[PDB]
Design a protein around this motif. Structure first.
Motif, PDB file in Angstrom:
ATOM      1  N   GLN A  43      13.151 -11.703 -32.302  1.00  0.00           N
ATOM      2  CA  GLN A  43      12.595 -13.011 -32.015  1.00  0.00           C
ATOM      3  C   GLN A  43      13.668 -14.028 -31.681  1.00  0.00           C
ATOM      4  O   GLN A  43      13.440 -14.852 -30.800  1.00  0.00           O
ATOM      5  CB  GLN A  43      11.750 -13.495 -33.200  1.00  0.00           C
ATOM      6  CG  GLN A  43      10.547 -12.602 -33.423  1.00  0.00           C
ATOM      7  CD  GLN A  43       9.764 -12.864 -34.705  1.00  0.00           C
ATOM      8  OE1 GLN A  43      10.194 -13.610 -35.592  1.00  0.00           O
ATOM      9  NE2 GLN A  43       8.586 -12.250 -34.792  1.00  0.00           N
ATOM     10  N   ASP A  44      14.826 -14.005 -32.345  1.00  0.00           N
ATOM     11  CA  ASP A  44      15.907 -14.921 -31.984  1.00  0.00           C
ATOM     12  C   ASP A  44      16.414 -14.649 -30.570  1.00  0.00           C
ATOM     13  O   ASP A  44      16.672 -15.604 -29.825  1.00  0.00           O
ATOM     14  CB  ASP A  44      17.045 -14.872 -33.009  1.00  0.00           C
ATOM     15  CG  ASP A  44      16.772 -15.648 -34.296  1.00  0.00           C
ATOM     16  OD1 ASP A  44      15.809 -16.403 -34.332  1.00  0.00           O
ATOM     17  OD2 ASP A  44      17.580 -15.458 -35.233  1.00  0.00           O
ATOM     18  N   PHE A  45      16.610 -13.385 -30.191  1.00  0.00           N
ATOM     19  CA  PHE A  45      16.989 -13.118 -28.796  1.00  0.00           C
ATOM     20  C   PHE A  45      15.941 -13.668 -27.838  1.00  0.00           C
ATOM     21  O   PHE A  45      16.284 -14.289 -26.822  1.00  0.00           O
ATOM     22  CB  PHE A  45      17.151 -11.617 -28.535  1.00  0.00           C
ATOM     23  CG  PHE A  45      18.462 -11.037 -28.949  1.00  0.00           C
ATOM     24  CD1 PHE A  45      19.560 -11.076 -28.081  1.00  0.00           C
ATOM     25  CD2 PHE A  45      18.629 -10.381 -30.173  1.00  0.00           C
ATOM     26  CE1 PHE A  45      20.751 -10.498 -28.441  1.00  0.00           C
ATOM     27  CE2 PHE A  45      19.851  -9.816 -30.476  1.00  0.00           C
ATOM     28  CZ  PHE A  45      20.917  -9.860 -29.624  1.00  0.00           C
ATOM     29  N   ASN A  46      14.650 -13.447 -28.150  1.00  0.00           N
ATOM     30  CA  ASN A  46      13.620 -13.909 -27.228  1.00  0.00           C
ATOM     31  C   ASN A  46      13.613 -15.423 -27.130  1.00  0.00           C
ATOM     32  O   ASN A  46      13.403 -15.985 -26.053  1.00  0.00           O
ATOM     33  CB  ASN A  46      12.281 -13.330 -27.582  1.00  0.00           C
ATOM     34  CG  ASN A  46      12.198 -11.861 -27.136  1.00  0.00           C
ATOM     35  OD1 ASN A  46      12.750 -11.489 -26.089  1.00  0.00           O
ATOM     36  ND2 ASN A  46      11.409 -11.069 -27.850  1.00  0.00           N
ATOM     37  N   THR A  47      13.829 -16.121 -28.250  1.00  0.00           N
ATOM     38  CA  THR A  47      13.929 -17.579 -28.232  1.00  0.00           C
ATOM     39  C   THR A  47      15.083 -18.032 -27.339  1.00  0.00           C
ATOM     40  O   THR A  47      14.939 -18.978 -26.546  1.00  0.00           O
ATOM     41  CB  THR A  47      14.116 -18.122 -29.649  1.00  0.00           C
ATOM     42  OG1 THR A  47      12.916 -17.863 -30.418  1.00  0.00           O
ATOM     43  CG2 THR A  47      14.458 -19.593 -29.664  1.00  0.00           C
ATOM     44  N   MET A  48      16.230 -17.356 -27.456  1.00  0.00           N
ATOM     45  CA  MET A  48      17.367 -17.692 -26.622  1.00  0.00           C
ATOM     46  C   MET A  48      17.025 -17.581 -25.141  1.00  0.00           C
ATOM     47  O   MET A  48      17.333 -18.478 -24.361  1.00  0.00           O
ATOM     48  CB  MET A  48      18.528 -16.772 -26.962  1.00  0.00           C
ATOM     49  CG  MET A  48      19.758 -16.952 -26.135  1.00  0.00           C
ATOM     50  SD  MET A  48      21.047 -15.768 -26.501  1.00  0.00           S
ATOM     51  CE  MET A  48      20.493 -14.384 -25.583  1.00  0.00           C
ATOM     52  N   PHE A  49      16.418 -16.474 -24.706  1.00  0.00           N
ATOM     53  CA  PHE A  49      16.067 -16.307 -23.290  1.00  0.00           C
ATOM     54  C   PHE A  49      15.054 -17.354 -22.884  1.00  0.00           C
ATOM     55  O   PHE A  49      15.200 -18.009 -21.837  1.00  0.00           O
ATOM     56  CB  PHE A  49      15.569 -14.870 -23.026  1.00  0.00           C
ATOM     57  CG  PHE A  49      16.599 -13.814 -23.269  1.00  0.00           C
ATOM     58  CD1 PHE A  49      17.813 -13.871 -22.589  1.00  0.00           C
ATOM     59  CD2 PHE A  49      16.345 -12.751 -24.082  1.00  0.00           C
ATOM     60  CE1 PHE A  49      18.778 -12.901 -22.774  1.00  0.00           C
ATOM     61  CE2 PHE A  49      17.344 -11.751 -24.273  1.00  0.00           C
ATOM     62  CZ  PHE A  49      18.532 -11.854 -23.602  1.00  0.00           C
ATOM     63  N   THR A  50      13.982 -17.496 -23.659  1.00  0.00           N
ATOM     64  CA  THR A  50      12.955 -18.471 -23.302  1.00  0.00           C
ATOM     65  C   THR A  50      13.499 -19.897 -23.236  1.00  0.00           C
ATOM     66  O   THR A  50      13.119 -20.655 -22.326  1.00  0.00           O
ATOM     67  CB  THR A  50      11.715 -18.364 -24.162  1.00  0.00           C
ATOM     68  OG1 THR A  50      12.004 -18.597 -25.484  1.00  0.00           O
ATOM     69  CG2 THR A  50      11.153 -17.031 -24.185  1.00  0.00           C
ATOM     70  N   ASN A  51      14.420 -20.274 -24.131  1.00  0.00           N
ATOM     71  CA  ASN A  51      15.020 -21.602 -24.020  1.00  0.00           C
ATOM     72  C   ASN A  51      15.676 -21.785 -22.654  1.00  0.00           C
ATOM     73  O   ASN A  51      15.601 -22.871 -22.050  1.00  0.00           O
ATOM     74  CB  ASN A  51      16.103 -21.781 -25.074  1.00  0.00           C
ATOM     75  CG  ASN A  51      15.577 -21.969 -26.469  1.00  0.00           C
ATOM     76  OD1 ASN A  51      14.399 -22.202 -26.655  1.00  0.00           O
ATOM     77  ND2 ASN A  51      16.436 -21.836 -27.441  1.00  0.00           N
ATOM     78  N   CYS A  52      16.363 -20.748 -22.161  1.00  0.00           N
ATOM     79  CA  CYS A  52      17.007 -20.878 -20.865  1.00  0.00           C
ATOM     80  C   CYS A  52      15.966 -21.116 -19.772  1.00  0.00           C
ATOM     81  O   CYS A  52      16.155 -21.971 -18.895  1.00  0.00           O
ATOM     82  CB  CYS A  52      17.821 -19.612 -20.593  1.00  0.00           C
ATOM     83  SG  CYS A  52      18.855 -19.723 -19.136  1.00  0.00           S
ATOM     84  N   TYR A  53      14.875 -20.368 -19.803  1.00  0.00           N
ATOM     85  CA  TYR A  53      13.837 -20.541 -18.797  1.00  0.00           C
ATOM     86  C   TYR A  53      13.192 -21.923 -18.930  1.00  0.00           C
ATOM     87  O   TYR A  53      12.862 -22.564 -17.913  1.00  0.00           O
ATOM     88  CB  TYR A  53      12.818 -19.388 -18.864  1.00  0.00           C
ATOM     89  CG  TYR A  53      13.435 -18.014 -18.868  1.00  0.00           C
ATOM     90  CD1 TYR A  53      14.507 -17.703 -18.042  1.00  0.00           C
ATOM     91  CD2 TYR A  53      12.949 -16.993 -19.713  1.00  0.00           C
ATOM     92  CE1 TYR A  53      15.094 -16.486 -18.059  1.00  0.00           C
ATOM     93  CE2 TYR A  53      13.527 -15.727 -19.714  1.00  0.00           C
ATOM     94  CZ  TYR A  53      14.603 -15.469 -18.887  1.00  0.00           C
ATOM     95  OH  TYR A  53      15.261 -14.276 -18.878  1.00  0.00           O
ATOM     96  N   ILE A  54      13.006 -22.417 -20.143  1.00  0.00           N
ATOM     97  CA  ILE A  54      12.402 -23.737 -20.353  1.00  0.00           C
ATOM     98  C   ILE A  54      13.317 -24.857 -19.855  1.00  0.00           C
ATOM     99  O   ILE A  54      12.871 -25.825 -19.205  1.00  0.00           O
ATOM    100  CB  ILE A  54      12.079 -23.921 -21.842  1.00  0.00           C
ATOM    101  CG1 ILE A  54      10.907 -23.011 -22.222  1.00  0.00           C
ATOM    102  CG2 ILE A  54      11.715 -25.363 -22.161  1.00  0.00           C
ATOM    103  CD1 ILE A  54      10.653 -22.837 -23.716  1.00  0.00           C
ATOM    104  N   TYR A  55      14.604 -24.804 -20.201  1.00  0.00           N
ATOM    105  CA  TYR A  55      15.500 -25.917 -19.859  1.00  0.00           C
ATOM    106  C   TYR A  55      15.833 -25.941 -18.381  1.00  0.00           C
ATOM    107  O   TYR A  55      16.188 -27.009 -17.861  1.00  0.00           O
ATOM    108  CB  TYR A  55      16.778 -25.860 -20.734  1.00  0.00           C
ATOM    109  CG  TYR A  55      17.735 -26.970 -20.399  1.00  0.00           C
ATOM    110  CD1 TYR A  55      17.403 -28.318 -20.664  1.00  0.00           C
ATOM    111  CD2 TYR A  55      18.928 -26.699 -19.686  1.00  0.00           C
ATOM    112  CE1 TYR A  55      18.252 -29.341 -20.242  1.00  0.00           C
ATOM    113  CE2 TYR A  55      19.760 -27.737 -19.269  1.00  0.00           C
ATOM    114  CZ  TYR A  55      19.401 -29.041 -19.534  1.00  0.00           C
ATOM    115  OH  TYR A  55      20.228 -30.030 -19.093  1.00  0.00           O
TER     116      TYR A  55
END
Ligand SMILES: CN1C(=O)c2cccc3c2C1=Cc1cccnc1N3Cc1cccc(C(N)=O)c1
Length: 125
Positions: free
Chosen positions: A85-97
């Motif tokens: 879940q932490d890896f997925n949060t990291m990737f998704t943050n990049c797509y969001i920002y």
């Protein structure tokens, strides 16, 4: 301006070591770390250094592989799914920002594919 980085220890949270978490450190994280696109994701985003004063106005659950690495080294996680879940949060943050087609997004996309390849099969208990 920078918030404190995510915690890497928390004494009221129970720790665990599992074969899957050991693999996430030795194989998944340490291999992704070496990829040519890993460098943006090896430490918390320093919004002051990078002149991104909006970053933490947008990203409310920051995450990065430096933090993940330290959490794995500390046995911070209960199970492999928590770390994933932490890896997925990291990737998704990049797509969001950012937005599709940006260089940083192309980097995340490639790393995410490698991450999924590596977690497709995990060791058993
Ligand atoms: C996770 N993360 C972002 O979401 C993001 C958005 C914009 C800028 C960065 C990041 C970033 C991490 C990062 C870490 C270390 C140094 N700099 C970083 N940068 C520079 C960069 C990387 C790639 C492309 C560009 C560009 N604008 O061409 C700029």
């Amino acid at each position: 301006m920078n918030p404190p980085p995510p915690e890497t220890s928390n004494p009221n949270k129970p720790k665990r070591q599992t074969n899957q978490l050991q693999y996430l450190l030795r194989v998944v994280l340490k291999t992704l770390w070496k990829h040519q696109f890993a460098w943006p994701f090896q430490q918390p985003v320093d919004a002051v250094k990078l002149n991104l004063p909006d970053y933490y106005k947008i990203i409310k659950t920051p995450m990065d592989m430096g933090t993940i690495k330290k959490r794995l080294e500390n046995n911070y996680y209960w199970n492999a799914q928590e770390c994933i879940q932490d890896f997925n949060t990291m990737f998704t943050n990049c797509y969001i920002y950012n937005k599709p087609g940006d260089d940083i997004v192309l980097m995340a996309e490639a790393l995410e594919k490698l991450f999924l390849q590596k977690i497709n099969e995990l060791p058993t208990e």
